CSV table of C-alpha atoms in Angstrom, one decimal:
chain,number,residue,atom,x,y,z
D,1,UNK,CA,85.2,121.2,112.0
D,2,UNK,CA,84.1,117.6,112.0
D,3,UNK,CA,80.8,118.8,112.8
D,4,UNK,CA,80.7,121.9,110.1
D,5,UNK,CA,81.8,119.0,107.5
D,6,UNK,CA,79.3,116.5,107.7
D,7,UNK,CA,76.1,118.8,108.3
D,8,UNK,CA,77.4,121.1,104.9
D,9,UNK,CA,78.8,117.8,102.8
D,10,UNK,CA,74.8,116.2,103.2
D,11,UNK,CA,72.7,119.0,104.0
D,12,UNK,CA,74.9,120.6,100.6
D,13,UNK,CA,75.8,123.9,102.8
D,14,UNK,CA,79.4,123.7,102.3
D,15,UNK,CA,79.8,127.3,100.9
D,16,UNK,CA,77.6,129.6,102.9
D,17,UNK,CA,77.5,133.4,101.6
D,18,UNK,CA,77.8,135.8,104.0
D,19,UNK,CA,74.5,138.5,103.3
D,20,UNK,CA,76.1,140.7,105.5
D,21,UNK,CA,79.6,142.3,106.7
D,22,UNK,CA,80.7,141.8,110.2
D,23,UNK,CA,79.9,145.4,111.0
D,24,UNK,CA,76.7,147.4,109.9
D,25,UNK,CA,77.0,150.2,107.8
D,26,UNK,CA,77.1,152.8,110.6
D,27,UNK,CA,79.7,150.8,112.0
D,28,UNK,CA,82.0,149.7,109.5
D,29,UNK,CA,83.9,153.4,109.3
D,30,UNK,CA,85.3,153.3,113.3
D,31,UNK,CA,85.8,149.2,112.6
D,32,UNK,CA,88.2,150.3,109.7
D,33,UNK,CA,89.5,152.8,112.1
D,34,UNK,CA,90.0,150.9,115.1
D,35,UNK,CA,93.2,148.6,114.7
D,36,UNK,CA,91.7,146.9,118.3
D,37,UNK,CA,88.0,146.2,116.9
D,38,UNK,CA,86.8,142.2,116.8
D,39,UNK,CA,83.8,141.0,116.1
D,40,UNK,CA,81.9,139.1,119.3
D,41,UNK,CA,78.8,136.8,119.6
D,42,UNK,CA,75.2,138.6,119.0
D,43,UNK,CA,72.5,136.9,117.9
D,44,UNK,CA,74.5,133.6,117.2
D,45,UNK,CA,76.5,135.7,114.5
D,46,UNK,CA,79.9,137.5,115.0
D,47,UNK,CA,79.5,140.9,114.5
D,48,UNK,CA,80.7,144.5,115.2
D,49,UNK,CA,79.9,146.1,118.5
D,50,UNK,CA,79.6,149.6,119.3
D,51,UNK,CA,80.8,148.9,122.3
D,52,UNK,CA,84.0,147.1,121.2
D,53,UNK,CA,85.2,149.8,119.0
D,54,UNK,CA,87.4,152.5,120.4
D,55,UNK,CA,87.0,151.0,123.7
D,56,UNK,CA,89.8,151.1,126.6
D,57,UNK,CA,89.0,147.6,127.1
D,58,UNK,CA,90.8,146.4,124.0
D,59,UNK,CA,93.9,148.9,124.4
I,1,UNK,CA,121.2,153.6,100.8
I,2,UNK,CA,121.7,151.8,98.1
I,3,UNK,CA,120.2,155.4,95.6
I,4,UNK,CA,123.2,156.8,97.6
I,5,UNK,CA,125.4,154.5,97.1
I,6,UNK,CA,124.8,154.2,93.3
I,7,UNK,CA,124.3,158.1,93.2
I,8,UNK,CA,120.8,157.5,91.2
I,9,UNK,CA,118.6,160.8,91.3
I,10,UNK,CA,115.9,160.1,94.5
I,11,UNK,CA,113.2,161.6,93.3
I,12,UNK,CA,110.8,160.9,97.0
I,13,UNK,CA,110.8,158.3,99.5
I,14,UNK,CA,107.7,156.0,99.2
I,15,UNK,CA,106.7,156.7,103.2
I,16,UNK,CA,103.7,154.4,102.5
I,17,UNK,CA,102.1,151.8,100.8
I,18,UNK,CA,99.1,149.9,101.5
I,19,UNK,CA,95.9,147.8,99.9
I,20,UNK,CA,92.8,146.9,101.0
I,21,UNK,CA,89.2,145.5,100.8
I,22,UNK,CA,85.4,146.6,101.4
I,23,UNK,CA,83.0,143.8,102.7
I,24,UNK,CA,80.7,141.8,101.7
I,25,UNK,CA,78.6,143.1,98.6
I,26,UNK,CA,77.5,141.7,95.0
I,27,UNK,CA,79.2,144.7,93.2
I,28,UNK,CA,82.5,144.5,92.1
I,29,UNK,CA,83.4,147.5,90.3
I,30,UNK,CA,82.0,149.8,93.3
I,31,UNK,CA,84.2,151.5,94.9
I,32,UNK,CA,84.4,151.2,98.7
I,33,UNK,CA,86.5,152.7,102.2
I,34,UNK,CA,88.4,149.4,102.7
I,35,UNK,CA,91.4,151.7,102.6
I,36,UNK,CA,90.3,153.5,105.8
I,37,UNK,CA,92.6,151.5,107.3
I,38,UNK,CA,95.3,153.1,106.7
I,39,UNK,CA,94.3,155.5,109.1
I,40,UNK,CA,93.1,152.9,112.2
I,41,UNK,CA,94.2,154.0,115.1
I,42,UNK,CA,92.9,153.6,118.5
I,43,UNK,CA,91.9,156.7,120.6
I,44,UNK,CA,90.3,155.3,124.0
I,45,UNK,CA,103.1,159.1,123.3
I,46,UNK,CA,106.4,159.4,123.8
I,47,UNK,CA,106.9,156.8,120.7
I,48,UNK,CA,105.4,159.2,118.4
I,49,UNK,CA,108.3,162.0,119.6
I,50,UNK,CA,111.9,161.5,117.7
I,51,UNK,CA,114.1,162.6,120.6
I,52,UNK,CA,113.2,159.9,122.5
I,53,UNK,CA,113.6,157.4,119.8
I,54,UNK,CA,116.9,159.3,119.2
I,55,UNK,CA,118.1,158.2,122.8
I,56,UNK,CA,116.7,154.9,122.5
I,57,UNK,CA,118.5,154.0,119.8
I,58,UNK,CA,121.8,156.1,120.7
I,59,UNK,CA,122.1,153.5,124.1
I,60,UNK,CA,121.0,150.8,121.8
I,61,UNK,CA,124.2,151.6,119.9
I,62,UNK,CA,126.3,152.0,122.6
I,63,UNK,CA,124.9,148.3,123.7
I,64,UNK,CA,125.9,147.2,120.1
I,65,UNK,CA,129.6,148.4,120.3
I,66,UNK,CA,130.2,147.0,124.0
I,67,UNK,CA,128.8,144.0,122.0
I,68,UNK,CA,131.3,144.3,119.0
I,69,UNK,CA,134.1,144.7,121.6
I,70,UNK,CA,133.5,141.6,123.5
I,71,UNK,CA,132.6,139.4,120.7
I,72,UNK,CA,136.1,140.6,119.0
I,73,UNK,CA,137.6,140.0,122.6
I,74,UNK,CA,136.3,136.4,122.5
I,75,UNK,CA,137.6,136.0,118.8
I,76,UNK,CA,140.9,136.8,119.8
I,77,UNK,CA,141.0,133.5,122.5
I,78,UNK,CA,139.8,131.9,119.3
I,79,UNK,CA,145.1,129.5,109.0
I,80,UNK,CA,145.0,131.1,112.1
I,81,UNK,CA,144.8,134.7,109.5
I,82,UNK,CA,142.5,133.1,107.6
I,83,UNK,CA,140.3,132.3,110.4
I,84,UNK,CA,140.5,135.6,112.2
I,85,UNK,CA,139.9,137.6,108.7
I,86,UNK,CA,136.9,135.4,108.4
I,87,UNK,CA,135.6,135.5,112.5
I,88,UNK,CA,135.8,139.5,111.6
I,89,UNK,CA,134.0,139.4,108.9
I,90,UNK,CA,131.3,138.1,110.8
I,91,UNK,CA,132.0,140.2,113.9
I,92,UNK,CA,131.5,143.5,111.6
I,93,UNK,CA,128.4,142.4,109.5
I,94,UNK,CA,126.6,141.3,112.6
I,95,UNK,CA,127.7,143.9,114.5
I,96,UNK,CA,125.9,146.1,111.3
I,97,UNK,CA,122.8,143.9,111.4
I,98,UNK,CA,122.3,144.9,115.1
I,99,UNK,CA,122.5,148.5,114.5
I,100,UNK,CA,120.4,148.1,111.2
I,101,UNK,CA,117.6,146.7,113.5
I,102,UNK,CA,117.8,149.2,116.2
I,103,UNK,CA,117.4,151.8,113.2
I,104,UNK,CA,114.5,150.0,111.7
I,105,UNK,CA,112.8,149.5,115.2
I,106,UNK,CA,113.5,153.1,116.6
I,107,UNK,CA,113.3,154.9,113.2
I,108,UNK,CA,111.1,153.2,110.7
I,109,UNK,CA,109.0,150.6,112.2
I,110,UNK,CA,108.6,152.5,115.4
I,111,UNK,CA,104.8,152.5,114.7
I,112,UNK,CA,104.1,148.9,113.8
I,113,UNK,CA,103.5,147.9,116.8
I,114,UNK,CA,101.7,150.4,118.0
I,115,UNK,CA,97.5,150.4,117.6
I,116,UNK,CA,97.8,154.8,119.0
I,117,UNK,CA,99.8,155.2,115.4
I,118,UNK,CA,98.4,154.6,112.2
I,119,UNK,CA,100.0,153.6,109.5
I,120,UNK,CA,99.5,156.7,107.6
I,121,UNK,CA,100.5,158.7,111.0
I,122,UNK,CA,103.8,156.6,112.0
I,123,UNK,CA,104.9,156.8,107.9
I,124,UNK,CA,104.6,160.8,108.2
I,125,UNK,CA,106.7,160.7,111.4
I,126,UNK,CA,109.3,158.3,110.0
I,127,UNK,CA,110.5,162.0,108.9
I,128,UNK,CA,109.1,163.7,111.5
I,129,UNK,CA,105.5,164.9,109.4
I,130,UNK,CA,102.4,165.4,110.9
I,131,UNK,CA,99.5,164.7,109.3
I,132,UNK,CA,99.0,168.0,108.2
I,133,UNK,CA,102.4,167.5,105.9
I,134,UNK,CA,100.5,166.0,103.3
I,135,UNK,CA,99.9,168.7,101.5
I,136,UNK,CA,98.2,167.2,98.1
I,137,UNK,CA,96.2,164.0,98.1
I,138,UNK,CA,96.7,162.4,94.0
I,139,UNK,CA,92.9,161.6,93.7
I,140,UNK,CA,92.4,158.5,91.3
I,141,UNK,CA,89.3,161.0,90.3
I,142,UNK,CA,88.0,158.6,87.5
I,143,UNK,CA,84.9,161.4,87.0
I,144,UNK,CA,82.6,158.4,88.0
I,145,UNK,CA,80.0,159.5,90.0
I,146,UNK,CA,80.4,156.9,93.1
I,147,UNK,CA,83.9,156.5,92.9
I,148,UNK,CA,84.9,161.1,93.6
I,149,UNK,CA,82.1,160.2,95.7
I,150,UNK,CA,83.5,157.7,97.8
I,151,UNK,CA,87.0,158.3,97.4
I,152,UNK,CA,86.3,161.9,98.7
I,153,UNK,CA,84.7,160.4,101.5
I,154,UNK,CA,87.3,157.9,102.5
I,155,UNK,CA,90.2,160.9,102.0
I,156,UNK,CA,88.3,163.1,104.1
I,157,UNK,CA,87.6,160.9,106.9
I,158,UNK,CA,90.8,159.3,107.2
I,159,UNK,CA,92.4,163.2,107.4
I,160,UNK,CA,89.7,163.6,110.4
I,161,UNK,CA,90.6,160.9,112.2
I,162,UNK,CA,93.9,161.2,111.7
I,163,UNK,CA,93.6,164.9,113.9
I,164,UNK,CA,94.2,166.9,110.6
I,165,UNK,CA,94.0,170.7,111.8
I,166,UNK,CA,90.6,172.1,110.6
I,167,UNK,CA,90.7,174.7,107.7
I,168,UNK,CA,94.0,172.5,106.6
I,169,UNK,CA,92.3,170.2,103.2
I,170,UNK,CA,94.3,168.4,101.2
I,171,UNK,CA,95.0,170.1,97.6
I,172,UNK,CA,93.2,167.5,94.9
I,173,UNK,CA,95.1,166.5,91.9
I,174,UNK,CA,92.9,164.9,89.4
I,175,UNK,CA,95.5,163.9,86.5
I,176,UNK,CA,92.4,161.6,84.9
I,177,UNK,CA,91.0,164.8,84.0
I,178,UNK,CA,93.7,165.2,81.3
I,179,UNK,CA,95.3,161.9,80.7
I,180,UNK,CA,92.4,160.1,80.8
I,181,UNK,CA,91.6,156.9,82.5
I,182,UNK,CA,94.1,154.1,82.1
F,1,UNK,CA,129.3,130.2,114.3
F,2,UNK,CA,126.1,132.0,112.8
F,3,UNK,CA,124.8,128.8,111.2
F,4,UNK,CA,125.0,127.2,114.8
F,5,UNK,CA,122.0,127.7,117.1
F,6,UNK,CA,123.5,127.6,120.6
F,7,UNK,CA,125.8,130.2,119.2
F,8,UNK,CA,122.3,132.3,118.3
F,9,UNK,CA,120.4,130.9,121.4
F,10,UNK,CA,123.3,132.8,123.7
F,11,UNK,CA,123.3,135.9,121.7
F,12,UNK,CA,120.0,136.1,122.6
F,13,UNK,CA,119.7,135.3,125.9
F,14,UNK,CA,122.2,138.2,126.7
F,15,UNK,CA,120.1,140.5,124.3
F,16,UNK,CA,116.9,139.6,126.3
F,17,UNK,CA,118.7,140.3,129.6
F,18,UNK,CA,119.6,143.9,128.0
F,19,UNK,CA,116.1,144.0,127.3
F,20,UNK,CA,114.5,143.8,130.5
F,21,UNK,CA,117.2,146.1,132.6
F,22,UNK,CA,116.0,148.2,129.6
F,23,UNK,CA,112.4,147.7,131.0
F,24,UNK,CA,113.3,148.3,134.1
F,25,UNK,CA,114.9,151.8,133.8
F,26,UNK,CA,111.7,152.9,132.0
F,27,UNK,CA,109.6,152.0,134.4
F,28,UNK,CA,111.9,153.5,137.2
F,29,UNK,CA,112.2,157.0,134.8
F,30,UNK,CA,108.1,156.4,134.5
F,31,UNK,CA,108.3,156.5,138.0
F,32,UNK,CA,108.9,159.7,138.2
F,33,UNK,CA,107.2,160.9,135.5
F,34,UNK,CA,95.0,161.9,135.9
F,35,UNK,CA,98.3,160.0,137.0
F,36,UNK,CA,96.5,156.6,137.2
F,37,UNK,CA,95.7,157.2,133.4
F,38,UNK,CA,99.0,158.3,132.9
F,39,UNK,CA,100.4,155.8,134.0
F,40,UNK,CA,98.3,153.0,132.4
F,41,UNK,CA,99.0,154.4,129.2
F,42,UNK,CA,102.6,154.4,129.9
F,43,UNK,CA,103.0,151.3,130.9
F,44,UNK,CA,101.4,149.6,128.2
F,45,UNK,CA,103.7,151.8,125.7
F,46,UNK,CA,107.1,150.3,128.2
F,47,UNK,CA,105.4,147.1,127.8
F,48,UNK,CA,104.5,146.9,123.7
F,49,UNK,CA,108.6,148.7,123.4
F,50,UNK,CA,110.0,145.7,125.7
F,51,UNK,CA,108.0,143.2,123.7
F,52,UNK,CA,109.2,144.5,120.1
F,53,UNK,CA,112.6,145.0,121.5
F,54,UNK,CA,112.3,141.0,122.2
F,55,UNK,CA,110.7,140.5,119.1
F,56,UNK,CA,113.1,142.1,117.0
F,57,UNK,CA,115.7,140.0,118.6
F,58,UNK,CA,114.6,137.2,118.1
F,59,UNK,CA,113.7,138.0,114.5
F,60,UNK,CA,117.0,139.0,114.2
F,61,UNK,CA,119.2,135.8,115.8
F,62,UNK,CA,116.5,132.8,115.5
F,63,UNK,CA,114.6,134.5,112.0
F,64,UNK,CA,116.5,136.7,110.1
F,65,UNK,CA,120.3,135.2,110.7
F,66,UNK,CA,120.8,134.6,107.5
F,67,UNK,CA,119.5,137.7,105.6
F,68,UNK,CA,122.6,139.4,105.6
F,69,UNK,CA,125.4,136.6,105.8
F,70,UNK,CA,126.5,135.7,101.8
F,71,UNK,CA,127.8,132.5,103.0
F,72,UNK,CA,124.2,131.2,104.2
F,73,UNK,CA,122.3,130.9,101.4
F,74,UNK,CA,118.4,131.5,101.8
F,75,UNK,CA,117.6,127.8,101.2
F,76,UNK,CA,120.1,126.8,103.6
F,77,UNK,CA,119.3,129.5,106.2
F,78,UNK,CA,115.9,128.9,105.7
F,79,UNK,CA,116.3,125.1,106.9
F,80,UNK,CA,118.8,126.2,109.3
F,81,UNK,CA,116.4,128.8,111.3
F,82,UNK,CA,114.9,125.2,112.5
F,83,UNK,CA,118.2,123.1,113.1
F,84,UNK,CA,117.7,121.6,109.7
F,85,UNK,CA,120.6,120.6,107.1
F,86,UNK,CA,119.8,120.9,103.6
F,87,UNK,CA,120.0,117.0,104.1
């Protein structure tokens, strides 16, 4: 958080829109479905996974 | 209990209620399915059966009385009137709040806690409904072209996931066709 | 003796023990009823039921205490579900 502060209070990034959801279109329906879903690291973003959603892993 | 108690006409039992969100976007009025959810459940159950609940809770009462018994047992070692109407008193209503719990745990938040029932699901079978109970679905139907769109989507796909039997639709009521759009 | 904590604290201990030869008669009656799947799934459902059943009690005698006594009030139960007075 310290870190987060300081490079958004100078560099003026406090409030940074998100362009995009968590999960992608194709995915957002079995996210809303899945009470177990959560979003993981990909591409330095946390996103939905195919793979995380429905899996037995979660449950 | 307390439309019973008062006698008031009970005209349904509100099994369900629930709100939600889309996602990101930069459109506000468009609809979206952020109330899917009320249909998440996870598919990768004896909880979902009422006779096993039944027994839970009927040895979860039995529990509760042995309880009663020994905590009046107790009170009895312990305005001697005053205090014993008063130690009672408590005895009774506590004795009441444990069996109220059991109830709500074993009969109406049974499915809470579990990810297997949704929401929608575990409501139904707090009366022992299936899914294919709900016989009309009270469309908001606002003749907009995206929103019977995608509220006819969300219904639909929530009835799928939720194992509706096929051939089994939900009837449409679209009151906004005659009262308008408040 | 509602609005005193050791009072609660022991009602719940006993209520946990309950809770857990509760677990263990499941598990036993599991016993005997794709068995490894079976049985995964089972135990995770004896598992989530023994953990509400320990939630609710707690909710109940650490939480709740007050929701149903008039003579707590919901200020005072409030403070009270931490050991605090309205002092």
């Amino acid at each position: 958080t310290y870190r987060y502060m300081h490079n958004a209070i100078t560099r003026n990034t406090m409030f940074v829109a998100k362009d995009k959801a968590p999960y992608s279109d194709e995915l957002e329906q079995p996210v809303y479905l899945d009470p177990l879903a959560r979003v993981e690291e990909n591409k330095k973003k946390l996103v939905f996974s195919d793979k995380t959603i429905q899996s037995n892993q979660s449950y | 209990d307390l439309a019973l108690k008062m006698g008031v006409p009970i005209h349904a039992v509100l099994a369900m209620t629930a709100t939600a969100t889309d996602k990101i976007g930069r459109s506000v009025p468009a609809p979206g399915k952020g109330i899917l959810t009320t249909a998440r459940e996870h598919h990768g159950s004896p909880l979902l059966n009422i006779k096993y609940r039944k027994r839970q809770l009927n040895k979860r009462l039995e529990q509760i009385k042995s309880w009663e018994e020994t905590e009046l047992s107790y009170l009895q070692e312990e305005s001697m009137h005053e205090f014993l109407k008063e130690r009672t008193e408590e005895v009774y209503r506590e004795s009441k709040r444990q069996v109220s719990d059991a109830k709500k745990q074993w009969g109406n938040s049974f499915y809470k806690s579990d990810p297997r029932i949704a929401p929608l699901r575990g409501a139904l079978a707090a009366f022992n409904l299936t899914i294919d109970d709900i016989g009309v679905a009270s469309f908001h139907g606002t003749s907009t072209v995206a929103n019977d769109k995608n509220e006819s989507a969300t219904i639909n796909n929530m009835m799928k996931h939720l194992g509706r039997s096929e051939g089994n639709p939900v009837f449409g009521v679209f009151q906004k066709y005659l009262t308008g759009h408040p």
